[PDB]
Amino acid sequence: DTPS
Amino acid sequence: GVTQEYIQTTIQKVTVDCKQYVCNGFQKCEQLLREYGQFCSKINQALHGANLRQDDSVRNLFASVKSSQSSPIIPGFGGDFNLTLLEPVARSAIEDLLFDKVTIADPGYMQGYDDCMQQGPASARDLICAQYVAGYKVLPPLMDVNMEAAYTSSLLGSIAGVGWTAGLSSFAAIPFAQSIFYRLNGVGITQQVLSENQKLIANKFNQALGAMQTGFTTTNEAFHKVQDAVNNNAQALS
Amino acid sequence: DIVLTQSPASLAVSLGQRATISCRASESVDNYGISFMNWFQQKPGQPPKLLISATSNQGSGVPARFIGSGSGTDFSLNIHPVEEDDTAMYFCQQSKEVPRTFGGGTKLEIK
Amino acid sequence: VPGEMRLASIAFNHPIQVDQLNSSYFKLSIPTNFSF
Amino acid sequence: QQLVRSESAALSAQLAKDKVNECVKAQSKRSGFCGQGTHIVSFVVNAPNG
Amino acid sequence: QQLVRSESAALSAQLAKDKVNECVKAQSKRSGFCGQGTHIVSFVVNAPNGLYFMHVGYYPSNHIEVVSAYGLCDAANPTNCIAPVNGYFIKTNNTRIVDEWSYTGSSFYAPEPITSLNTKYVAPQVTYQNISTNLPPPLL
Amino acid sequence: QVQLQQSGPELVRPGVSVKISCKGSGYTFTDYAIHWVKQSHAKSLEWIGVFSTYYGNTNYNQKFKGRATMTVDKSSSTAYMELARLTSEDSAIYYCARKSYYVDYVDAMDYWGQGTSVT
């Protein structure tokens, strides 16, 4: 899922 | 004439559930295995590191295999040259001969353990079914055979665009027969001979291609090497 | 050089009417699929003006009103809404081979 | 927080296609820019 | 045993990469590699493990 | 364990020696080695337990398709035939040039006039163009 | 802002070698070859030649190839055409025009000079  | 070679690039990737291989769920053995728990940790570490190196070797190879540009490939490609290597849009006739002639044990990744279950034949004798007895897991290949075929057809489509200098930049896309004549000028055959004997060149080359249909026996050394690579993977598991 | 001819020598149409011009080449001018046909426009007191080129019906100085068509030896110009400010001499130009000659042309008129 | 993982297919970049032709001329692909 | 086999496969894969860039994508003038008859076009197909 | 590691290091050191004599001290024409962009100058620095290489490569962009010919000949005299050296004969799309054909380099698109410096004389072939007027090498 | 300023018309007597000039303005003159055209009637026009303004290479229509020659003055952004041995059959309107490529590999005559004449 879209990185931090 | 045609000569052939087989170059191995990978090992079948496996992992081992160390605890299950040593002991099949017994509580008395598990209490004892706590004393040796670091040995299973080291076995898992080493196998995992080996599997990463296999996958990286594959990606590094295919990064060099890919071309930036190619021709489309149709039936009738190559003109006077027959070319049974052409895709049946697939793999190829030669690949299907090679995969069928070698005695390959049935792959997993398809339903696998369900063919070792009671919902399947009584004659199954696969190493797939020995996996859950011993705690093996054979891992999948990192490519997919369709993607491997896409890379392979991309190499075939780059042939005869690499003449006339460079080939790492411009892509010439010229007629295949003409590129062969250009390669024959490159080994010191004069163009006068090449101009006159075009039909004879095509006939001799197609005879040399026709000889490949008898090359999938163990008297062919390259074929024998492919069979032994498969045998070695099975041998380690057994 | 390839000879270009055109017909009819003059054409009269009513205002707002479609009009066409036929153009014929003595030998085909297609080489490598390119066609090389340009059309030009001239009025009295003016230089010739480029209208269109082989793949550019719009562009090359005009709106899509000037529609070039055809291939090989046969070409045409097609204009669907003619006005009195389209009355001009019109010419086929060959860009394919030296010495780049071009047709005698036709005259558009209004009824 | 970030949510669930996403199943994806590995992309395959198709190389640029150039049509092979018969006759006395051919199509050529050539670079117009570059970087070191 | 597996660590040894894995390393030998990696070295063999490096040889495969070199042959694709010298015999498949170009005409070779070196001899040595390939069948011994100078060299003209070579081809690659997929095999079990290689 | 140490004997195995020592032997693999010796084999790896032999590879390093070959790269210094083909990529550092000379331009490579082989491809394969180095970053894939042909090859121009490479450099070496010291690393922990080994050598660290840097390879400068030349990477293409913005490719276009153009019409090209295998070679050109005099239509009046079949023995006068030429073929481009390290480049291609392309149909002219540049407004400086007043000729049907132009010369360009192999790695970079840029039209130029066809002159004796860019070409070589060859035997005639059926795919060569039959040029009826303006050829400067040979002028005849 | 492209311009092609031809030199003014003249009733030149026969046997003169006649030079006509055309001056480019508002664009880089050395990037475009100049075409020259002769117009004897509303329906009779013919190409005369083309002059590269970068390299000086020329082509001429074969009928004028031993009469007409072309040259440049790069410092004044100007091209010249000089026609040897004038006769009454050369009384005509003359033009200069800029080479262009709106369509790939197709010559176009783009912007034209305003017209000059010789008689």
Side-chain angles (χ1 to χ4, degrees), chain C residues 62-109:
Chain C
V62 301
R65 297 177 77 247
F66 300 78
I67 303 166
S69 183
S71 70
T73 60
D74 293 337
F75 294 92
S76 68
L77 180 64
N78 181 14
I79 302 168
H80 281 293
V82 171
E83 63 181 18
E84 196 170 21
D85 293 330
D86 294 306
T87 52
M89 289 78 75
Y90 290 106
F91 312 93
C92 296
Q93 167 81 64
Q94 173 193 235
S95 295
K96 178 185 177 179
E97 70 175 7
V98 296
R100 303 292 198 268
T101 64
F102 54 109
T106 70
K107 182 73 191 304
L108 191 63
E109 295 296 349

XYZ file of all heavy atoms in Angstrom, chain C residues 62-109:
366
model
N -3.579 26.637 -44.458
C -5.055 26.679 -44.632
C -5.872 25.931 -43.553
O -5.326 25.136 -42.785
C -5.502 26.073 -45.977
C -4.878 26.791 -47.142
C -5.183 24.605 -45.983
N -7.198 26.199 -43.480
C -8.247 25.401 -42.844
C -8.555 24.133 -43.631
O -8.290 24.052 -44.834
C -9.464 26.336 -42.809
C -9.212 27.316 -43.884
C -7.733 27.548 -43.807
N -9.242 23.190 -42.966
C -9.715 21.904 -43.529
C -10.661 21.986 -44.762
O -10.874 20.969 -45.418
C -10.434 21.123 -42.445
N -11.170 23.182 -45.117
C -11.904 23.468 -46.349
C -11.249 22.998 -47.654
O -11.963 22.700 -48.595
C -12.087 24.966 -46.491
C -12.912 25.628 -45.416
C -12.962 27.097 -45.606
N -13.873 27.475 -46.668
C -13.516 28.024 -47.848
N -12.256 28.271 -48.131
N -14.443 28.327 -48.734
N -9.915 22.947 -47.724
C -9.228 22.491 -48.927
C -8.843 21.025 -48.805
O -7.808 20.708 -48.230
C -7.974 23.323 -49.136
C -8.263 24.776 -49.293
C -8.549 25.548 -48.184
C -8.249 25.377 -50.533
C -8.817 26.893 -48.309
C -8.517 26.723 -50.668
C -8.801 27.483 -49.554
N -9.667 20.123 -49.327
C -9.385 18.705 -49.161
C -8.706 18.079 -50.366
O -9.341 17.831 -51.388
C -10.676 17.945 -48.884
C -11.350 18.522 -47.647
C -10.389 16.468 -48.713
C -12.775 18.066 -47.474
N -7.421 17.795 -50.236
C -6.699 17.019 -51.216
C -7.065 15.550 -51.110
O -7.279 15.029 -50.008
N -7.051 14.866 -52.245
C -7.291 13.434 -52.273
C -6.648 12.757 -53.465
O -6.110 13.416 -54.352
C -8.766 13.137 -52.285
O -8.970 11.751 -52.247
N -6.737 11.430 -53.477
C -6.277 10.595 -54.584
C -4.863 10.044 -54.403
O -4.172 10.369 -53.437
N -4.455 9.182 -55.341
C -3.140 8.541 -55.325
C -2.718 8.093 -56.726
O -3.537 8.027 -57.646
C -3.146 7.347 -54.396
O -3.919 6.307 -54.928
N -1.455 7.717 -56.872
C -0.969 7.249 -58.156
C -0.864 8.394 -59.136
O -0.098 9.340 -58.931
N -1.603 8.269 -60.238
C -1.674 9.312 -61.245
C -2.842 10.272 -61.072
O -2.901 11.269 -61.782
C -1.802 8.715 -62.652
O -2.991 7.917 -62.721
C -0.602 7.866 -62.989
N -3.800 9.965 -60.189
C -5.010 10.790 -60.100
C -5.124 11.516 -58.781
O -5.109 10.897 -57.725
C -6.251 9.933 -60.298
C -6.377 9.379 -61.708
O -5.805 9.944 -62.612
O -7.046 8.388 -61.869
N -5.291 12.828 -58.834
C -5.446 13.608 -57.618
C -6.584 14.572 -57.744
O -7.015 14.909 -58.846
C -4.170 14.376 -57.269
C -3.026 13.497 -56.908
C -2.127 13.085 -57.872
C -2.852 13.071 -55.607
C -1.088 12.253 -57.546
C -1.805 12.242 -55.276
C -0.924 11.828 -56.248
N -7.085 15.028 -56.615
C -8.116 16.024 -56.688
C -8.102 16.982 -55.535
O -7.564 16.694 -54.471
C -9.473 15.361 -56.761
O -9.783 14.725 -55.554
N -8.755 18.110 -55.750
C -9.007 19.082 -54.702
C -10.494 19.145 -54.521
O -11.219 19.141 -55.503
C -8.452 20.464 -55.070
C -8.672 21.578 -54.032
C -7.913 21.231 -52.766
C -8.189 22.907 -54.591
N -10.954 19.176 -53.281
C -12.372 19.236 -52.978
C -12.691 20.301 -51.941
O -12.233 20.212 -50.808
C -12.829 17.875 -52.514
C -14.282 17.806 -52.185
O -15.073 18.694 -52.522
N -14.656 16.743 -51.526
N -13.472 21.315 -52.328
C -13.890 22.366 -51.395
C -15.394 22.428 -51.294
O -16.052 22.774 -52.263
C -13.397 23.753 -51.833
C -11.871 23.786 -51.962
C -13.871 24.795 -50.823
C -11.371 25.023 -52.661
N -15.945 22.083 -50.133
C -17.399 22.019 -49.982
C -18.196 23.345 -49.821
O -19.387 23.345 -50.127
C -17.755 21.090 -48.824
C -17.690 19.651 -49.178
N -18.559 19.070 -50.072
C -16.872 18.665 -48.750
C -18.281 17.785 -50.177
N -17.263 17.514 -49.384
N -17.591 24.453 -49.346
C -18.350 25.726 -49.276
C -17.670 26.866 -50.002
O -17.078 27.722 -49.346
C -18.409 26.050 -47.795
C -17.131 25.538 -47.285
C -16.945 24.258 -48.016
N -17.722 26.891 -51.326
C -17.006 27.928 -52.065
C -17.577 29.342 -51.897
O -18.784 29.561 -51.960
C -16.966 27.548 -53.553
C -16.429 28.688 -54.400
C -16.071 26.336 -53.702
N -16.682 30.313 -51.721
C -17.059 31.723 -51.657
C -16.304 32.480 -52.729
O -15.380 31.938 -53.325
C -16.773 32.311 -50.280
C -15.313 32.326 -49.870
C -15.121 32.902 -48.503
O -16.084 32.972 -47.778
O -14.020 33.272 -48.176
N -16.699 33.732 -53.004
C -16.065 34.542 -54.066
C -14.582 34.884 -53.818
O -13.824 35.081 -54.770
C -16.855 35.833 -54.299
C -16.504 36.537 -55.611
C -17.434 37.675 -55.963
O -18.090 38.181 -55.087
O -17.490 38.034 -57.119
N -14.132 34.832 -52.556
C -12.723 34.962 -52.224
C -11.899 33.663 -52.378
O -10.690 33.685 -52.146
C -12.592 35.476 -50.800
C -13.095 36.903 -50.670
O -13.005 37.628 -51.633
O -13.568 37.258 -49.618
N -12.512 32.570 -52.874
C -11.773 31.422 -53.366
C -11.503 31.495 -54.874
O -10.890 30.570 -55.410
C -12.539 30.117 -53.120
C -12.725 29.727 -51.667
O -11.762 29.650 -50.937
O -13.850 29.499 -51.288
N -11.924 32.564 -55.572
C -11.694 32.598 -57.008
C -10.259 32.895 -57.306
O -9.765 33.995 -57.062
C -12.571 33.634 -57.691
O -12.418 34.906 -57.046
C -14.005 33.194 -57.632
N -9.585 31.884 -57.814
C -8.164 31.942 -58.016
C -7.725 30.895 -59.004
O -8.480 29.976 -59.331
C -7.465 31.751 -56.697
N -6.507 31.039 -59.499
C -5.915 29.979 -60.264
C -5.463 28.904 -59.296
O -4.974 29.222 -58.214
C -4.766 30.487 -61.103
C -5.187 31.352 -62.275
S -5.603 33.036 -61.778
C -3.969 33.703 -61.474
N -5.582 27.641 -59.684
C -5.153 26.552 -58.818
C -4.247 25.582 -59.533
O -4.518 25.210 -60.668
C -6.348 25.810 -58.254
C -7.133 26.607 -57.254
C -8.368 27.143 -57.576
C -6.597 26.816 -56.004
C -9.052 27.887 -56.637
C -7.288 27.555 -55.079
C -8.499 28.089 -55.388
O -9.153 28.841 -54.448
N -3.158 25.173 -58.867
C -2.127 24.370 -59.534
C -1.724 23.123 -58.768
O -1.533 23.173 -57.559
C -0.851 25.185 -59.696
C -1.036 26.559 -60.244
C -1.187 27.626 -59.382
C -1.049 26.796 -61.599
C -1.342 28.902 -59.866
C -1.204 28.072 -62.089
C -1.346 29.128 -61.221
N -1.494 22.031 -59.497
C -0.839 20.840 -58.942
C 0.662 20.979 -59.002
O 1.196 21.259 -60.068
C -1.171 19.587 -59.733
S -2.880 19.118 -59.717
N 1.346 20.701 -57.896
C 2.804 20.724 -57.849
C 3.396 19.383 -57.503
O 3.051 18.791 -56.481
C 3.267 21.754 -56.828
C 4.742 21.700 -56.435
C 5.658 22.375 -57.429
O 5.558 23.590 -57.609
N 6.542 21.618 -58.069
N 4.341 18.925 -58.328
C 5.076 17.709 -58.027
C 6.350 17.990 -57.243
O 7.190 18.756 -57.710
C 5.453 17.009 -59.314
C 6.354 15.844 -59.083
C 6.974 15.338 -60.327
O 6.857 14.158 -60.655
N 7.661 16.230 -61.021
N 6.516 17.372 -56.065
C 7.785 17.485 -55.338
C 8.703 16.253 -55.473
O 9.807 16.254 -54.933
C 7.520 17.768 -53.867
O 6.898 19.020 -53.708
N 8.249 15.211 -56.173
C 8.977 13.951 -56.318
C 10.321 13.959 -57.022
O 11.247 13.290 -56.566
C 8.139 12.952 -57.078
C 8.877 11.648 -57.303
C 8.078 10.714 -58.171
C 8.837 9.434 -58.470
N 8.036 8.494 -59.303
N 10.430 14.646 -58.154
C 11.656 14.539 -58.938
C 12.005 15.815 -59.646
O 11.146 16.657 -59.905
C 11.552 13.433 -59.976
C 10.591 13.742 -61.104
C 10.595 12.693 -62.175
O 11.229 11.681 -61.978
O 9.974 12.895 -63.193
N 13.290 15.959 -59.924
C 13.800 17.110 -60.621
C 13.314 17.125 -62.062
O 13.242 16.073 -62.695
C 15.319 17.110 -60.597
C 15.813 17.236 -59.172
C 15.810 15.825 -61.226
N 13.019 18.301 -62.609
C 13.211 19.646 -62.051
C 11.938 20.268 -61.496
O 11.665 21.430 -61.780
C 13.733 20.450 -63.240
C 13.141 19.786 -64.406
C 13.264 18.339 -64.056
N 11.169 19.512 -60.697
C 10.057 20.032 -59.896
C 9.014 20.824 -60.671
O 8.573 21.870 -60.183
C 10.584 20.940 -58.783
C 11.589 20.334 -57.810
C 10.976 19.286 -56.956
N 11.769 18.998 -55.765
C 12.720 18.048 -55.683
N 13.016 17.318 -56.720
N 13.357 17.847 -54.547
N 8.621 20.365 -61.866
C 7.663 21.147 -62.629
C 6.249 20.912 -62.159
O 5.954 19.995 -61.376
C 7.756 20.895 -64.136
O 7.426 19.539 -64.417
C 9.163 21.198 -64.624
N 5.388 21.803 -62.606
C 4.042 21.835 -62.133
C 3.058 22.263 -63.203
O 3.459 22.736 -64.268
C 4.006 22.688 -60.874
C 4.551 24.064 -60.876
C 3.687 25.126 -60.794
C 5.914 24.306 -60.891
C 4.177 26.402 -60.713
C 6.408 25.581 -60.824
C 5.537 26.631 -60.729
N 1.780 21.968 -62.952
C 0.713 22.070 -63.945
C 0.350 23.489 -64.348
O 0.581 24.444 -63.607
N -0.273 23.610 -65.529
C -0.787 24.886 -66.047
C -1.944 25.464 -65.220
O -2.059 26.676 -65.072
N -2.757 24.602 -64.628
C -3.737 25.041 -63.660
C -5.118 25.297 -64.209
O -5.343 25.251 -65.419
N -6.046 25.579 -63.287
C -7.436 25.862 -63.635
C -7.920 27.112 -62.936
O -7.359 27.495 -61.920
C -8.381 24.723 -63.218
O -8.483 24.701 -61.791
C -7.882 23.376 -63.691
N -8.992 27.722 -63.445
C -9.543 28.933 -62.818
C -10.919 28.735 -62.194
O -11.882 28.430 -62.898
C -9.637 30.054 -63.841
C -10.162 31.355 -63.262
C -9.116 32.001 -62.383
C -9.672 33.156 -61.561
N -10.317 34.202 -62.408
N -11.025 28.965 -60.885
C -12.331 28.932 -60.238
C -13.077 30.245 -60.449
O -12.495 31.320 -60.319
C -12.186 28.640 -58.751
C -13.488 28.315 -58.005
C -14.091 27.036 -58.571
C -13.184 28.130 -56.535
N -14.369 30.142 -60.750
C -15.253 31.278 -60.986
C -16.550 31.156 -60.191
O -16.903 30.071 -59.724
C -15.598 31.391 -62.477
C -14.431 31.713 -63.394
C -13.839 33.064 -63.117
O -14.434 33.815 -62.382
O -12.790 33.352 -63.646
